[PDB]
Amino acid sequence: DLSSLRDPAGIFELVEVVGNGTYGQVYKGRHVKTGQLAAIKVMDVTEEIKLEINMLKKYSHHRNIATYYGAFIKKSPPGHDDQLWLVMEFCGAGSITDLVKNTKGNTLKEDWIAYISREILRGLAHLHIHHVIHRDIKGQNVLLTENAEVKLVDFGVNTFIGTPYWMAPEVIACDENPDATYDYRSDLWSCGITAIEMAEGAPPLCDMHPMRALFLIPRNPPPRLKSKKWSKKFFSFIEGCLVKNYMQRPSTEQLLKHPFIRDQPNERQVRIQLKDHIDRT
Amino acid sequence: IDLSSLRDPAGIFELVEVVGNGTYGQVYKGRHVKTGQLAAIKVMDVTEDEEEEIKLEINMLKKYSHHRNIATYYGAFIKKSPPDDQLWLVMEFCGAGSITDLVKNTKGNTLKEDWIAYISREILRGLAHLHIHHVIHRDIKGQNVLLTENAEVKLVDFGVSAQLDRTVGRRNTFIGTPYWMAPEVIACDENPDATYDYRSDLWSCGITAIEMAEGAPPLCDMHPMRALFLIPRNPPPRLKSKKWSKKFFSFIEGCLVKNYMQRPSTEQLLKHPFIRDQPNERQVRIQLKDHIDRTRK
Numbered sequence A: 001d002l003s004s005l006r007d008p009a010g011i012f013e014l015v016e017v018v019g020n021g022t023y024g025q026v027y028k029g030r031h032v033k034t035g036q037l038a039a040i041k042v043m044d045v046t047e048e049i050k051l052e053i054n055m056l057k058k059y060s061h062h063r064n065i066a067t068y069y070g071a072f073i074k075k076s077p078p079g080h081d082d083q084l085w086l087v088m089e090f091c092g093a094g095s096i097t098d099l100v101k102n103t104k105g106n107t108l109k110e111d112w113i114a115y116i117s118r119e120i121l122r123g124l125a126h127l128h129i130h131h132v133i134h135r136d137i138k139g140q141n142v143l144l145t146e147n148a149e150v151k152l153v154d155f156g157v158n159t160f161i162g163t164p165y166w167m168a169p170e171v172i173a174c175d176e177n178p179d180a181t182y183d184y185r186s187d188l189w190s191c192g193i194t195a196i197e198m199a200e201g202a203p204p205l206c207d208m209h210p211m212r213a214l215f216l217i218p219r220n221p222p223p224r225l226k227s228k229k230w231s232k233k234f235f236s237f238i239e240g241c242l243v244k245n246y247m248q249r250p251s252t253e254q255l256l257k258h259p260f261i262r263d264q265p266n267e268r269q270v271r272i273q274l275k276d277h278i279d280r281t
Numbered sequence B: 001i002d003l004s005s006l007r008d009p010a011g012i013f014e015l016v017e018v019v020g021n022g023t024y025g026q027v028y029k030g031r032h033v034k035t036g037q038l039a040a041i042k043v044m045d046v047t048e049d050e051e052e053e054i055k056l057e058i059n060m061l062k063k064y065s066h067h068r069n070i071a072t073y074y075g076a077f078i079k080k081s082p083p084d085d086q087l088w089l090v091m092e093f094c095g096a097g098s099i100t101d102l103v104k105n106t107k108g109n110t111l112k113e114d115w116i117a118y119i120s121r122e123i124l125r126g127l128a129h130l131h132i133h134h135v136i137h138r139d140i141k142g143q144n145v146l147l148t149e150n151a152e153v154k155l156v157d158f159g160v161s162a163q164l165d166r167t168v169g170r171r172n173t174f175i176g177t178p179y180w181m182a183p184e185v186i187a188c189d190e191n192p193d194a195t196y197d198y199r200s201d202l203w204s205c206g207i208t209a210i211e212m213a214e215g216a217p218p219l220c221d222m223h224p225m226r227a228l229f230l231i232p233r234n235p236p237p238r239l240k241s242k243k244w245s246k247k248f249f250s251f252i253e254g255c256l257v258k259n260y261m262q263r264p265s266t267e268q269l270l271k272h273p274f275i276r277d278q279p280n281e282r283q284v285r286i287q288l289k290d291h292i293d294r295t296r297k
């Protein structure tokens, strides 16, 4: 398999690094013959894994998951590590973190949050039914197309630990919880924190040292929204996502049936406003 | 050419290679504009708000002279962009790669016992210089220890005093890689607040010596989240093999005292027989020189 992946030369070229580090070596690439854009993840190969591809092949075809196109291996000196290119759907509008970052008052209107949270839960549902936990839901992994469509990137379940602010309490080992549990509901916690991140512009504990946030998440009560302006429905949704003990955290299906997620008599108008916002920048 | 301000790099430093590997802390080859000499330049795109954070911590920097075992930090620069600017951190160029590269390009990924003592000593000497000047290096590891073609051993310093490459940019929120971390830097049940100390560098140096001996630090074989949990709760890690000398084991035991309050200083560790007594010093220096030559073909 791996040994049958062609050189990308003449097929995809790299344009530039996107996300300025949040994803590692992920480039905006273009399909040479057509000029269509693609995001390309570039890794030195030394690690039959090689199974990241099989995941992306089976599980990316859902509309809320960025589509896997294909893989290439670039011939490198005697002499030097070969590079593997993973080529994915390009999501032009960018991350939902960036959206809130660029909005005035670093906050999104509540029905934008309902729309987006639902899209994330839909992508997550697709992964969970196929027994896959994303394990790193956060606004930086939730992407937007020009079409104002919502797509999850960067899943699977390495040597560096990323940002801790969206991690569920249970996935953080401690004296009482020695073997740090990843359960599909962990993603639901992360989704709730992503909802707070959309409402306030940053996750709870954003002002802590990452290490101190890691210490605190399992020891703290569930985070709550700072302002009081939000609807009872949103408070309740956030509350559902952030059930401290995952054993009583609602399932993905249940949260999708939560009133805040289910009753959206503004989808059409909301989807148009996001379109409007994306273009205005 | 001052370390106490951030200026336009125009006429002082410039890049020699194209920036196509990213601008979030990637290092590129560069040039002192007046002299023509080589320079390693770390490049980071930076928001205006991060530029202010930058000025603040530039004031936080402490003064320390050049040293044979520290790749000289030359200062901090910002280059503007179509009115996100770039942060540049400039450092002495070391052509012959890192110690991680040294172990990787070695038969069976294991340095022999006298190479270890020599490199470890060089690391320790550079640290002593940092420590007498009240600065903690904070990231001692194989990858952060460099070789020149003269086989000189030098620590990476992109402004370690105020951690400029660490505090700014899209991944400054990342926990990082846990394996070289001293127990006291990890927040846990008995350690609610990370306490960085000079002696934290010495734990990392002990983990670095195991990295030279085995090609990888302890706990390499498990999820970094799990290793992070384990470092404060495990007894001090040890060398796997029994081949190593009684002096090497003792040195590893010297560095890897779990309670930093009772770990030796850098000076005390410089006097450790494994570091102090190097009969074959001259011989390994050339052995290293040899290795670097062969590797570039």
Ligand SMILES: CCCCCC(=O)c1c(O)c(-c2ccc(O)cc2)c[nH]c1=O
Pocket: A018, A019, A023, A026, A039, A040, A041, A066, A088, A089, A090, A091, A092, A093, A094, A095, A143, A153, A154, A155
């Ligand atoms: C123009 C600004 C939009 C950036 C697009 C972007 O960041 C994109 C990605 O980072 C990824 C992405 C792909 C694989 C991965 O492991 C992590 C991220 C996919 N598609 C994108 O579109």
